[PDB]
């Protein structure tokens, strides 16, 4: 504690009462005329001292970019395998190789290698770090075993048992009676004296100090953001970023497995998403009388951010207005992720232990790729990995479509990507021969959305293979018939007629699909009859409990009536069954106390404009919007309020 070293790299005299050795060392370093008066042995040691100080930081005294070099951080899953294959020259080469083994799943091999390194360690810091990393590997193995036993059956549908029962028993026997907190005390006195800086690694919660510092800095940054104060010197945001990089480089460079645990993931997610929030607030600075994402930021967000965390970050701040630098490196990282997923799932399943650890980062990277410009080759590789080979359990049809459409934002759909979408649709149609099979999406988007995207980006695209299937279609396979029905715009004219031969509007869902594809442009009397018959059925089923589903059909009928698409006045008989139908059918007597502001989100420019121009229900909606904008920070209610003044 004689001196104070901080993130920027400038030493500060803190508790030094005797001669100031650090100030003199810096003076001798900056003025190297003297460096010769030093004893030759002392000068040789000073050379190494300067090298060590400049590599780590400590650029000079207080009064006067990050590069993390590790195959684990960069996701070089292929270089790491080759490195593991090569015979290890030294013990440190075995320690790094064991860390790499742990990175690529393979926790059994990593545990065995760490045990061997501990055995052969007779500096003394390699044995300490191997003990810590072996404890971490045992912890991860135990947690993964518990998850596979309990959760694995549900998530994967089949029990896995990546680690043999004999191995688990052996590791339990070995690691029992091993107290992590006493791992440092039971060390040679020389090691304890020299390696006092490693003490914090011994405890099972070593990120508490860093987490507390990040909490204090976050509170300070939030205070500045709320008050609007101006920070002149090294801002707390810069301090947070510098400490985040210090921790990331220290844990990854030293091959410490604790970098893969939930505590560090949450620490990095909070360290980021606070730089991002402050950066976004900086653009909205109130003038009175920038921060951009590099390759490292992209990698950190991909690794340590869950999809929900990225969604929240997007919600709070418009993250598409943040400049994304090093886009070549980001695209290389994304292509590497896509190639790894393709290599895994294209042939012979995958490594379940590695899968559980890597799928989160793969999904986060492909979700965050919306903000980067990807070349046609890289974009095609990413799309093929996302659609064909990405696990079904992780990304369903709707979520996968959202990922693809987000990718489409920065890079418009080319013909190469259109071909991938086309053969993905062909494969999905091929899957639609089993009557039990049906594509279910948690988002609510389906293959028809892929067809709509294809048409939107081409508007003249004709799918040869789907048209071929339609021409081969017969009445026997009804599932293929109604799957191709939703893809009618992609089908050829002959295919269109051949499919329409067996296609009939039997139910309301069929009519809705026909409207969506474009087969229906004006309601014929038969369609009105079907709609009214469905409304009769719903009302009859209504008539002492009430159940409200999420079908939304009644809201669609109400919107149709409000827009004059349906011009038969029999709908008023059903008024009172469900809201958002009375609002559009009879707005005047709707008793808007039941009105839901969220409804206004689902409407579009045409419907919102009609609602605003109604002038017999506009005032209530304007009130709802005004209170929603005042109370909430959504910023979409404000957009609705000011775009049409509804």
């Amino acid at each position: 504690y004689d001196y104070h070293f901080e993130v920027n790299g400038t030493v500060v005299r803190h508790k030094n009462k005797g001669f100031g050795y650090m100030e003199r060392f810096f003076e001798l370093k900056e003025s190297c005329d003297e460096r010769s008066k030093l004893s030759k042995k002392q000068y040789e040691r000073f050379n190494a001292l300067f090298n060590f100080f400049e590599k780590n930081g400590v650029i000079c005294m207080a009064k006067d970019s990050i590069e993390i070099n590790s195959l684990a951080y960069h996701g070089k899953y292929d270089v790491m395998k080759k490195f593991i294959e090569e015979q290890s020259v030294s013990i440190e080469d075995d320690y790094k190789k064991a860390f790499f083994l742990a990175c690529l799943g393979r926790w059994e091999e990593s545990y065995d290698l760490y045990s061997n390194i501990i055995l052969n360690s007779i500096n003394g810091c390699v044995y300490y770090l191997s003990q810590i990393n072996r404890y971490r590997i045992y912890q991860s193995i135990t947690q993964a075993v518990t998850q596979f036993n309990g959760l694995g059956l549900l998530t994967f549908g089949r029990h896995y048992k990546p680690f043999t029962d004999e191995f688990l028993a052996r590791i339990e026997r070995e690691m029992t009676n091993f107290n992590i907190d006493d791992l440092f005390n039971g060390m040679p006195f020389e090691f304890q004296k020299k390696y006092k800086i490693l003490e914090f690694l011994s405890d099972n919660q070593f990120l508490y100090d860093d987490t507390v510092k990040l909490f204090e800095l976050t509170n300070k940054v939030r205070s500045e953001m709320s008050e609007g104060s101006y920070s002149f010197g090294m801002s707390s945001d810069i301090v947070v970023l510098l400490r985040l990089y210090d921790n990331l480089r220290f844990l990854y460079e030293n091959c410490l497995w604790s970098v893969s645990f939930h505590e560090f993931h949450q620490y990095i997610r909070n360290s980021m998403s606070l730089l991002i929030e402050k950066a976004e607030y900086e653009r909205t600075r109130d003038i009175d009388e920038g921060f951009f994402m590099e390759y490292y930021d992209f990698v950190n967000i991909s690794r340590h951010f869950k999809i929900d965390d990225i969604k929240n970050l997007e919600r709070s701040c418009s993250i598409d207005k943040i400049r994304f630098g090093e886009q070549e490196k980001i695209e290389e990282y994304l292509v590497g992720i896509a190639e790894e997923i393709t290599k895994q799932f294209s042939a012979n399943g995958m490594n379940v232990v590695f899968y559980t650890q890597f799928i989160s980062e793969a999904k986060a990277a492909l979700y965050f790729a919306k903000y980067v410009k990807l070349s046609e080759e890289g974009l095609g590789k990413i799309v093929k990995a996302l659609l064909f080979y990405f696990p079904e359990r992780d990304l369903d049809i709707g979520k996968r479509y959202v990922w693809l459409e987000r990718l489409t934002k920065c890079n418009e759909l080319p013909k190469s990507i259109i071909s991938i979408i086309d053969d993905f649709l062909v494969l999905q149609a091929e899957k639609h021969i089993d009557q039990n099979y049906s594509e279910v999406s948690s988002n609510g988007l389906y293959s028809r959305d892929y067809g709509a995207l294809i048409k939107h980006f081409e508007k003249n695209f004709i799918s040869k293979r789907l048209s071929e299937i339609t021409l081969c279609l017969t009445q026997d396979k009804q599932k293929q018939i109604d799957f191709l029905f939703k893809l009618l715009p992609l089908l050829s004219t002959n295919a269109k007629s051949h499919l329409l031969s067996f296609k009939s509007v039997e139910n309301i869902n069929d009519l809705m699909n026909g409207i969506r594809i474009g087969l229906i442009d004006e309601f014929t009397p038969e369609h009105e009859e079907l709609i009214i018959e469905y409304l009769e059925t719903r009302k009859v089923n209504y008539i002492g409990i009430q159940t409200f589903s999420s079908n939304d059909y009644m809201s669609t009928f109400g919107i149709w009536y409000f827009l004059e698409e349906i011009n038969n006045s029999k709908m008023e008989e059903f008024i009172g069954m469900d809201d958002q139908y009375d609002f559009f059918v009879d707005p005047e007597n709707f008793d808007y106390k039941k009105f839901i502001p969220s409804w206004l989100k689902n409407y579009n420019d045409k419907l919102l404009g009609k609602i605003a121009g109604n002038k017999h229900m506009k005032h209530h909606v304007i009130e709802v919007l005004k209170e929603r904008v005042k109370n909430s920070n959504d910023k979409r209610y404000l957009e609705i309020l000011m775009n049409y003044f509804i």
Partner: protein, 116 residues
């Protein structure tokens, strides 16, 4: 402090039981540009749910060696996909929290049914 009952969709078998902890329905409109015609009322309805203490049925565990959710008013999700995102902590790990997302079949086009 309401309970969530997990059932295998095919039969009445109980996959597991838990207590509902967090339920988020962030269902709003999607992109406008990317998707004169008759209105269709596009939507991106999403329903996530979390369960705090879920214990898997012993018979189901033994047998294992589509899912439905009944949240008890009574809510029912005919189709739910459990998101198996496993993360480990340095603090030896103990609450097994199960997150699942409601799915919507194209024909039914309904995700959740809440009835009194």
């Amino acid at each position: 402090t309401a309970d969530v009952y997990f059932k295998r969709k095919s039969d009445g078998k109980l996959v597991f039981t838990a207590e509902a902890q967090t339920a988020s329905f962030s269902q709003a409109i999607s992109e406008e540009k990317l998707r004169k015609p008759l209105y269709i009322l596009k939507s991106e309805k999403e329903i996530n749910l979390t369960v705090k203490n879920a214990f898997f049925d012993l018979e189901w565990l033994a047998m294992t060696q589509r899912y439905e959710v009944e949240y008890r008013i009574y809510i029912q999700f005919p189709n739910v996909s459990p998101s198996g995102e496993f993360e480990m902590s340095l603090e030896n790990g103990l609450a097994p929290e199960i997150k699942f997302e409601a799915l919507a079949d194209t024909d039914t086009d309904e995700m959740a049914v809440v009835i009194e």
